[PDB]
Amino acid sequence: MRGLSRRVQAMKPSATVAVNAKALELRRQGVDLVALTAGEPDFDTPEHVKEAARRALAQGKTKYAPPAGIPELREALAEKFRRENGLSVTPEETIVTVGGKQALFNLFQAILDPGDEVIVLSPYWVSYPEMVRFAGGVVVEVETLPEEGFVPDPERVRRAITPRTKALVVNSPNNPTGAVYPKEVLEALARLAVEHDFYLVSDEIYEHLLYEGEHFSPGRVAPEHTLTVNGAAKAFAMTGWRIGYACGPKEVIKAMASVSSQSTTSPDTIAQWATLEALTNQEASRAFVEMAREAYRRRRDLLLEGLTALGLKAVRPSGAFYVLMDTSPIAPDEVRAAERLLEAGVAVVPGTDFAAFGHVRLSYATSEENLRKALERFARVL
Amino acid sequence: MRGLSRRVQAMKPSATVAVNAKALELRRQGVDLVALTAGEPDFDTPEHVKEAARRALAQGKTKYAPPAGIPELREALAEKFRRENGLSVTPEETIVTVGGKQALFNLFQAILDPGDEVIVLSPYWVSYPEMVRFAGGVVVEVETLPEEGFVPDPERVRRAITPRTKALVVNSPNNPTGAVYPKEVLEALARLAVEHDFYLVSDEIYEHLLYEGEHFSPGRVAPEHTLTVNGAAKAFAMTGWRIGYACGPKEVIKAMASVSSQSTTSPDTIAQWATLEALTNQEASRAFVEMAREAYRRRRDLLLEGLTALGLKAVRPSGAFYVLMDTSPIAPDEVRAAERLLEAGVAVVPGTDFAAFGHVRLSYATSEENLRKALERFARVL
Numbered sequence: 123m124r125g126l127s128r129r130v131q132a133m134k135p136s137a138t139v140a141v142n143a144k145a146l147e148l149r150r151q152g153v154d155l156v157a158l159t160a161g162e163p164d165f166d167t168p169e170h171v172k173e174a175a176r177r178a179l180a181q182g183k184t185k186y187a188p189p190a191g192i193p194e195l196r197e198a199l200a201e202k203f204r205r206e207n208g209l210s211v212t213p214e215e216t217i218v219t220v221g222g223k224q225a226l227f228n229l230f231q232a233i234l235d236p237g238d239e240v241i242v243l244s245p246y247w248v249s250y251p252e253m254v255r256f257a258g259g260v261v262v263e264v265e266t267l268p269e270e271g272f273v274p275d276p277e278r279v280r281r282a283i284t285p286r287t288k289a290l291v292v293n294s295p296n297n298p299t300g301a302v303y304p305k306e307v308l309e310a311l312a313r314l315a316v317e318h319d320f321y322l323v324s325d326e327i328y329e330h331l332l333y334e335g336e337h338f339s340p341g342r343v344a345p346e347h348t349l350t351v352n353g354a355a356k357a358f359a360m361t362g363w364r365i366g367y368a369c370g371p372k373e374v375i376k377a378m379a380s381v382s383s384q385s386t387t388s389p390d391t392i393a394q395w396a397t398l399e400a401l402t403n404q405e406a407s408r409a410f411v412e413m414a415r416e417a418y419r420r421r422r423d424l425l426l427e428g429l430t431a432l433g434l435k436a437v438r439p440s441g442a443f444y445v446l447m448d449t450s451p452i453a454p455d456e457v458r459a460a461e462r463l464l465e466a467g468v469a470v471v472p473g474t475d476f477a478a479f480g481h482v483r484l485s486y487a488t489s490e491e492n493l494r495k496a497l498e499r500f501a502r503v504l
Numbered sequence: 505m506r507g508l509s510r511r512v513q514a515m516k517p518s519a520t521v522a523v524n525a526k527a528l529e530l531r532r533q534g535v536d537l538v539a540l541t542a543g544e545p546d547f548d549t550p551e552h553v554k555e556a557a558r559r560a561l562a563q564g565k566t567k568y569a570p571p572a573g574i575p576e577l578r579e580a581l582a583e584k585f586r587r588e589n590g591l592s593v594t595p596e597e598t599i600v601t602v603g604g605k606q607a608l609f610n611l612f613q614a615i616l617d618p619g620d621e622v623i624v625l626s627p628y629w630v631s632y633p634e635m636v637r638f639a640g641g642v643v644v645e646v647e648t649l650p651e652e653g654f655v656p657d658p659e660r661v662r663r664a665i666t667p668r669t670k671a672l673v674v675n676s677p678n679n680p681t682g683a684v685y686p687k688e689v690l691e692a693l694a695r696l697a698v699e700h701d702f703y704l705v706s707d708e709i710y711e712h713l714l715y716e717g718e719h720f721s722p723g724r725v726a727p728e729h730t731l732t733v734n735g736a737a738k739a740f741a742m743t744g745w746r747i748g749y750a751c752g753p754k755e756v757i758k759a760m761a762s763v764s765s766q767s768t769t770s771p772d773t774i775a776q777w778a779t780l781e782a783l784t785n786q787e788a789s790r791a792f793v794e795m796a797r798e799a800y801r802r803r804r805d806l807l808l809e810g811l812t813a814l815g816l817k818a819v820r821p822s823g824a825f826y827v828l829m830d831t832s833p834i835a836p837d838e839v840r841a842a843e844r845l846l847e848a849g850v851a852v853v854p855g856t857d858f859a860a861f862g863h864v865r866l867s868y869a870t871s872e873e874n875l876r877k878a879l880e881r882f883a884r885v886l
């Protein structure tokens with residue numbers, strides 16, 4: 123018989139997709155929309171990285187790479203994780219993937235048997251629950267509150283642990299909230315993993331997009347329980363390159379490379395060489411990160427002042443480039459809110475898919491000029 | 505609790521791995537080995553494709569691409585499948601993946617429920633059974649015989665169909681036998697699919713590497729039951745670029761795009777723009793393909809002549825760049841023969857993982873000087 127598998131059939135439809143199509147309708151009928159929907163840097167990838175790609179091409183590095191990545195990059199990864207994150211890892215406890223999303227996907231395929239439970243903290247990145255379910259797992263959600271600045275309360279996470287708990291996913295700096303979790307909270311979560319024996323999955327791709335506080339990595343205290351996920355996409359404006367990386371327990375990294383061998387073989391060889399330059403030339407990369415961080419901070423401040431002036435509520439973000447805005451004064455729910463804003467000329471992402479009901483995610487990875495136009499149209503709606 | 509999933513632990517230990525470790529050892533102790541193991545072209549990727557990638561870099565095409573691929577590429581894919589394969593497909597029945605391997609992986613994830621049977625023709629590419637089992641599928645092996653030139657008999661295939669049969673994988677030109685299946689055989693196989701209601705998966709990556717006969721795509725006779733898999737890897741010496749493509753039933757393609765969105769998002773954007781050039785610059789691309797095909801033809805003939813002179817048996821290949829050699833005169837089995845050849849200075853691939861027992865796979869994607877060098881060493885294992 124023909125027909126699709128149960129797993130692919132159990133994929134819920136996005137609310138973002140529904141609003142996106144309407145936005146195209148408007149653009150097509152000539153409506154000028156200011157988009158605050160981007161999930162990637164507006165900056166282009168830095169030249170030192172582009173130049174390394176050009177050299178790789180000229181040197182004919184166009185052949186299959188090992189499943190876990192080019193050895194040079196794995197060594198560079200071991201250094202980065204130790205130097206920047208205080209993580210005690212060897213090159214063999216490192217892996218290169220097709221974006222940080224593939225590292226997460228491979229991870230769940232490697233540790234989840236049907237029925238295994240994964241604790242997710244809402245609001246969450248849309249992809250976490252889908253990948254957990256795809257591998258046959260069970261999503262157990264724990265809520266973080268706006269009045270607590272979207273920082274998890276360890277006691278609330280405590281209530282979601284059962285004997286079937288396999289993993290707990292933590293994402294700081296956070297997408298969609300922009301919250302940076304304090305080290306004491308992160309240490310508390312790591313103690314739960316060690317006490318209850320499960321994996322702590324730390325999604326740290328926004329580590330360099332930090333305006334205040336410090337980025338702490340839970341693997342510093344519980345290396346055998348923690349799988350650290352990261353990548354080049356957000357910090358180096360390399361979303362289209364598809365290069366992610368992770369480190370953690372040897373047995374898990376090895377299993378993750380086995381999954382890559384049966385699915386993608388290895389990430390694009392030229393992108394691996396270009397990423398190696400991003401990691402080795404610290405001087406040029408630092409210059410890009412500081413330039414981007416200063417620009418995002420200015421943009422965040424501009425946006426927040428404006429929202430506040432209008433009376434619109436938003437928890438001040440400490441990292442990444444997103445702000446979750448309460449839509450109560452605009453409409454009774456996010457989707458309706460998103461549609462009215464579309465009609466006023468502003469495209470936003472409804473919070474539905476992230477489990478951030480009553481909110482809309484705004485992205486400031488745009489120009490100041492665009493941010494001021496958006497605040498104007500927002501004022502009209504009000 | 506912690507631990508690995510049963511699907512990752514269910515993966516078998518490769519026989520290619522044990523000889524390879526022995527080869528690494530030998531190479532460590534200085535030993536010179538002539539490798540006839542390559543699974544990729546020896547040629548570097550053609551200059552026009554390289555230039556198209558530099559253009560995308562200079563234009564800032566470094567952002568996220570749609571899950572099914574850049575629109576420009578899906579369009580050119582529709583033209584390719586129609587022009588070159590006689591396939592009437594629309595761009596929406598087309599998908600771009602992280603190599604042809606991902607296309608196959610995403611497909612099995614999208615169509616196989618635990619228990620479903622997939623018929624695979626042996627000798628087979630190592631990855632087929634792994635991909636089927638990883639998704640819950642049950643492999644059903646149908647042997648092809650050296651006496652029949654490794655071409656399947658529809659009759660033996662018919663005997664293997666059960667009410668649990670969901671798919672039949674066909675790979676022509678074949679890895680590792682080099683066999684090219686005749687249109688009539690390809691039509692008979694397609695017929696069983698329509699007649700017994702299951703999918704026919706046609707791996708056609710070596711289509712442009714054909715020395716005699718003609719490439720027929722079964723999708724022409726059962727378009728609703730067929731998923732045609734291809735890619736730029738073998739044809740344009742782009743293995744490290746990771747760009748594969750497929751076409752077939754609109755509902756399956758859409759499901760495959762859903763698997764990509766939760767795992768890799770989309771293939772590298774720079775590599776997609778590069779591939780469009782290979783697909784659209786018909787003039788430079790054919791010049792490359794004809795050049796390669798001539799070099800492979802010369803090399804196959806030299807290798808076949810030398811083997812016969814040595815009294816060694818191999819079924820004459822009409823496509824790809826492999827030769828399956830009978831190892832009985834050398835040792836009682838493939839593994840022992842491969843180790844003997846290693847000691848004699850030649851590295852080959854044992855037929856064990858491909859279900860080609862008593863054979864060893866030889867690759868002619870290396871220089872004639874290396875082929876000649878290997879042939880001289882062969883005298884020592886008689």
